[PDB]
Amino acid sequence: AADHTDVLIVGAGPTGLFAGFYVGMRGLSFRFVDPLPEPGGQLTALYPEKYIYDVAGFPKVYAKDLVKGLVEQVAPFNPVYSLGERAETLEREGDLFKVTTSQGNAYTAKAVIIAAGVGAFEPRRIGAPGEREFEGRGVYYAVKSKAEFQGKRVLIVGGGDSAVDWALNLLDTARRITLIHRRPQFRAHEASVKELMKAHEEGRLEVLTPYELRRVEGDERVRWAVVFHNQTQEELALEVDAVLILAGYITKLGPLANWGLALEKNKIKVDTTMATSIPGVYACGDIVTYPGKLPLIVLGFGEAAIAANHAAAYANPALKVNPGHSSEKAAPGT
Amino acid sequence: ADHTDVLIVGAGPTGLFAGFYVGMRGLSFRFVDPLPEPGGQLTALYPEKYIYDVAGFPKVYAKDLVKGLVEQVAPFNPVYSLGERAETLEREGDLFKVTTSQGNAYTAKAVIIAAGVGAFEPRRIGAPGEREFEGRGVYYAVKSKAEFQGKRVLIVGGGDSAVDWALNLLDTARRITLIHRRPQFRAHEASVKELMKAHEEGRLEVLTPYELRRVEGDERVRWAVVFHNQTQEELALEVDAVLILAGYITKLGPLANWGLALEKNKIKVDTTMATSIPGVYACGDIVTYPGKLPLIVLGFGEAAIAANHAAAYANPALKVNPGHSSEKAAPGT
Numbered sequence: 331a332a333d334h335t336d337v338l339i340v341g342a343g344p345t346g347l348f349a350g351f352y353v354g355m356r357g358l359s360f361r362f363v364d365p366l367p368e369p370g371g372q373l374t375a376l377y378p379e380k381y382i383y384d385v386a387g388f389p390k391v392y393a394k395d396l397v398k399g400l401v402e403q404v405a406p407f408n409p410v411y412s413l414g415e416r417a418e419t420l421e422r423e424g425d426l427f428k429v430t431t432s433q434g435n436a437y438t439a440k441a442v443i444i445a446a447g448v449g450a451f452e453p454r455r456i457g458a459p460g461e462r463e464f465e466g467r468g469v470y471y472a473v474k475s476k477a478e479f480q481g482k483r484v485l486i487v488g489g490g491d492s493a494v495d496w497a498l499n500l501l502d503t504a505r506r507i508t509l510i511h512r513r514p515q516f517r518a519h520e521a522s523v524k525e526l527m528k529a530h531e532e533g534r535l536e537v538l539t540p541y542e543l544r545r546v547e548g549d550e551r552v553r554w555a556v557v558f559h560n561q562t563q564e565e566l567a568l569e570v571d572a573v574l575i576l577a578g579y580i581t582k583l584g585p586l587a588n589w590g591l592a593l594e595k596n597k598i599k600v601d602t603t604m605a606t607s608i609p610g611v612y613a614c615g616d617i618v619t620y621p622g623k624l625p626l627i628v629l630g631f632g633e634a635a636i637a638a639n640h641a642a643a644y645a646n647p648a649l650k651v652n653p654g655h656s657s658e659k660a661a662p663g664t
Numbered sequence: 665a666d667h668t669d670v671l672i673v674g675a676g677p678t679g680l681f682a683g684f685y686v687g688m689r690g691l692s693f694r695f696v697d698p699l700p701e702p703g704g705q706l707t708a709l710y711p712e713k714y715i716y717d718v719a720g721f722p723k724v725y726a727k728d729l730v731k732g733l734v735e736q737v738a739p740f741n742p743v744y745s746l747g748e749r750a751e752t753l754e755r756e757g758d759l760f761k762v763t764t765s766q767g768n769a770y771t772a773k774a775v776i777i778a779a780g781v782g783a784f785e786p787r788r789i790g791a792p793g794e795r796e797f798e799g800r801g802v803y804y805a806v807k808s809k810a811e812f813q814g815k816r817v818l819i820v821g822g823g824d825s826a827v828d829w830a831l832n833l834l835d836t837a838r839r840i841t842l843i844h845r846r847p848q849f850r851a852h853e854a855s856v857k858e859l860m861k862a863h864e865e866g867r868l869e870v871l872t873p874y875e876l877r878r879v880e881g882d883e884r885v886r887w888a889v890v891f892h893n894q895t896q897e898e899l900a901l902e903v904d905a906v907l908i909l910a911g912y913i914t915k916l917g918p919l920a921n922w923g924l925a926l927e928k929n930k931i932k933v934d935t936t937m938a939t940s941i942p943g944v945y946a947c948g949d950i951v952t953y954p955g956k957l958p959l960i961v962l963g964f965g966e967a968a969i970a971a972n973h974a975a976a977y978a979n980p981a982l983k984v985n986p987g988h989s990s991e992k993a994a995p996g997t
């Protein structure tokens with residue numbers, strides 16, 4: 331896979347999404363690359379269920395709903411979402427930039443916007459014997475396709491908003507679902523939770539709390555999983571074909587430290603036009619640093635607007651940086 | 665009271681958000697703006713239009729974004745000192761003193777300048793008698809309908825404001841005469857059609873392209889002279905009121921006398937949004953730096969930076985970084 335776009339954006343968190351929106355507003359093509367399986371960054375991975383109060387114009391808005399808003403806002407420009415992939419290398423070849431992903435893919439772009447946040451997200455492991463051994467052979471950390479779980483007996487581990495959703499989404503395809511969580515309350519939206527417990531009572535699936543994963547067993551592939559009551563230590567052996575670990579994602583500075591960027595305390599140094607030390611490469615959001623920089627969504631959006639328009643002008647010299655009043659233009663997409 | 669921790673010049677979108685954040689840091693604040701309502705350019709210039717590049721809003725009417733910001737600021741009991749313009753900015757020890765066009769004097773520990781492109785003020789025609797009878801028959805806004813109940817009114821202007829009020833006073837005034845210096849009105853198309861319908865029905869006089877020559881009166885307005893700006897033909901109209909709704913203009917004005925380091929009428933700021941004067945921060949269209957763009961979304965970011973740094977300036981016990989709002993109590997309680 332070597333697709334090309336005018337601009338490639340590292341990170342599909344809130345700032346990356348808005349940057350993509352503006353790149354789209356300037357008439358350019360753009361691709362989002364992020365190891366997280368969906369858009370939203372920290373909002374989606376760490377607190378989708380919580381209200382945010384300091385985003386301009388929203389007296390109150392759920393992190394999950396803000397993401398939905400941003401996704402819908404970028405949609406008219408038909409973005410290319412290359413999620414589930416981490417940007418490993420950033421190289422310049424002639425008039426283009428080449429980025430190779432953790433999936434072996436090689437995308438190119440005329441300009442690059444780095445909205446990497448505090449680092450690349452990756453599934454957190456449970457640490458149970460057999461978990462690591464059977465990864466790829468019955469142990470999963472993401473659902474790439476529901477067919478992968480067709481007629482399968484599945485054990486889902488997790489208590490976050492993501493585990494709740496996948497348990498429900500799979501009732502549609504899995505033979506049997508069993509979900510364990512270390513405590514009674516889930517950190518997911520109340521409605522979704524009520525929907526899950528309803529399915530439990532209906533016998534559509536099985537929810538066990540407070541339970542944790544002791545170990546995964548198999549031969550050539552997963553055959554069983556042993557879970558345990560974290561208080562009484564009583565164990566339960568479940569016959570399963572797959573173990574879907576959805577215990578959240580964690581961040582690591584990662585690859586971006588190897589791109590030859592001017593950094594300061596693991597943050598990307600930028601001037602006021604959001605340009606990094608490398609020409610044609612811009613940044614915005616939690617990943618940048620400058621005097622007065624605050625790790626806030628509201629500032630991240632403003633930084634994205636700046637990065638996107640300067641990157642746009644860099645990728646297409648026929649464009650001025652200032653975009654003009656959106657209110658005086660045709661609705662996005664036309 | 666007369667004092668607040670921070671005084672914010674301008675109640676536009678960036679001023680409002682800056683106010684919100686100062687509030688979030690537990691400080692008192694006051695907005696000073698000649699406009700009677702908050703909103704700045706969105707309120708004064710394009711309230712009915714959809715905005716598409718405000719983060720998180722696939723589309724939002726300018727007027728609605730303003731009401732969202734006002735509701736967002738509300739819980740921190742803002743002091744809305746609207747209807748007055750900041751004329752002077754002085755510092756006495758550890759206080760900043762601001763006197764307004766209304767003779768008032770306000771004080772604060774820190775100031776945020778969110779002046780946009782200048783102070784808004786109704787556009788004047790410049791006709792003899794216009795300024796003379798202002799407040800005695802000549803108006804630049806509609807306080808209420810009863811103000812024009814049963815009166816003969818000459819309305820001047822060709823935008824949404826002039827057209828809407830001419831239509832909205834038809835059942836209030838004894839007679840309305842609407843004039844505009846251009847042949848065509850430039851208000852919403854639906855409004856223009858309604859105006860033409862009312863005119864065709866004989867509900868009011870509409871004269872274009874006409875202008876105000878002069879306003880006459882004794883202790884109040886009694887007559888007005890208007891003229892066709894092509895044929896130069898004049899017409900004397902017997903009226904009890906002259907309602908001028910010809911739009912707004914902005915004036916850098918007093919801001920050029922505050923001692924701030926400017927650059928082409930714009931306030932120079934560093935990345936923390938501090939101006940050349942310690943204790944004075946700025947944000948929005950009024951500031952300048954490489955890469956600055958006249959966008960609302962960027963103005964909000966600049967306002968967050970100025971509000972938090974201004975707050976730390978007013979209360980040195982506060983850390984500039986406010987921390988996550990989502991991990992604190994909802995605004996207000």
Ligand SMILES: Cc1cc2nc3c(=O)[nH]c(=O)nc-3n(C[C@H](O)[C@H](O)[C@H](O)COP(=O)(O)OP(=O)(O)OC[C@H]3O[C@@H](n4cnc5c(N)ncnc54)[C@H](O)[C@@H]3O)c2cc1C
Binds near residue numbers: 365370373625988
């Ligand atoms: C619990 C919590 C509560 C918060 N509450 C608030 C609040 O109320 N208000 C507020 O303003 N802020 C809040 N924040 C901060 C806010 O979440 C961040 O400011 C915001 O997420 C930054 O957005 P971003 O797009 O810059 O980066 P992020 O959302 O962090 O997204 C960066 C993305 O880029 C990806 N990425 C990184 N490196 C690579 C690579 N090499 N290749 C590909 N992809 C990569 C990541 O996987 C990630 O998805 C909170 C944070 C937390 C943890």
Ligand SMILES: Cc1cc2nc3c(=O)[nH]c(=O)nc-3n(C[C@H](O)[C@H](O)[C@H](O)COP(=O)(O)OP(=O)(O)OC[C@H]3O[C@@H](n4cnc5c(N)ncnc54)[C@H](O)[C@@H]3O)c2cc1C
Binds near residue numbers: 715780784
């Ligand atoms: C999608 C989009 C569409 C846009 N469309 C338009 C458009 O159609 N037309 C347009 O003109 N702009 C447009 N803009 C620009 C936008 O309106 C401005 O960027 C924004 O209004 C700036 O906000 P502000 O708070 O900095 O200042 P402003 O909204 O200009 O507000 C400044 C306020 O401070 C007050 N003030 C100034 N000096 C003083 C003083 N000395 N004492 C007291 N009060 C004072 C003013 O009276 C005013 O109310 C658009 C922007 C975007 C992102």
